[PDB]
Design a protein around this ligand. Structure first.
Ligand SMILES: O=P(O)(O)CP(=O)(O)O[C@@H]1[C@@H](OP(=O)(O)O)[C@H](OP(=O)(O)CP(=O)(O)O)[C@H](OP(=O)(O)O)[C@H](OP(=O)(O)O)[C@H]1OP(=O)(O)O
Length: 134
């Protein structure tokens, strides 16, 4: 079930999934619509679902990783898509081999140095590139 803020923006949560506490490499996943495009893993919050809980669930489903949830980075709007996304830091401690989106739609995942993640997100996902600019 999709959920919405009072202004009609779709509620979403996403994680910056870092390889380590150094926050030097981050996990991106492929788009299902365009498998040659990279995005930050995230998606819709369920009814009454805490944003931090949604963030952890979405990363598990989309990226097949678990770890230690850190700070809320911020709340980011995509005016074009009418999205409002809570973005968290996650330090990855478990990498699972056969996760929900791999099995179901063949979603890919890849480690990126921060500067290269910002580069690949800039064209289609400038708001996701801004997640890192803190
Ligand atoms: O596909 P996933 O959820 O993994 C990633 P994302 O949501 O970013 O994919 C969107 C897609 O949305 P969705 O597939 O319906 O959720 C868009 O679709 P919608 O927002 O539903 C617009 P639609 O109703 O499909 O015309 C539109 O895909 P499309 O329209 O080209 O199929 C975007 O592509 P673009 O056309 O903006 O370059 C594409 O963005 P991408 O991440 O591929 O750059």
């Amino acid at each position: 079930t999709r959920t919405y803020d009072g202004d009609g923006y779709k509620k979403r949560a996403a994680c910056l999934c870092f390889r380590s506490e150094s926050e030097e490499e981050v996990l991106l996943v492929s788009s299902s619509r365009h498998p040659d495009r990279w995005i930050v893993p995230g998606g819709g919050m369920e009814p009454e679902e805490e944003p931090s809980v949604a963030a952890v669930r979405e990363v598990c489903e989309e990226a097949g990783v678990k770890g230690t949830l850190g700070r809320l980075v911020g709340i980011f709007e995509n005016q074009e898509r009418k999205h409002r996304t809570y973005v968290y830091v996650l330090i990855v401690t478990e990498v699972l081999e056969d996760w929900e989106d791999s099995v179901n739609i063949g979603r890919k995942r890849e480690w990126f140095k921060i500067e290269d993640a910002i580069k690949v997100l800039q064209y289609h996902k400038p708001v996701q590139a801004s997640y890192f600019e803190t």
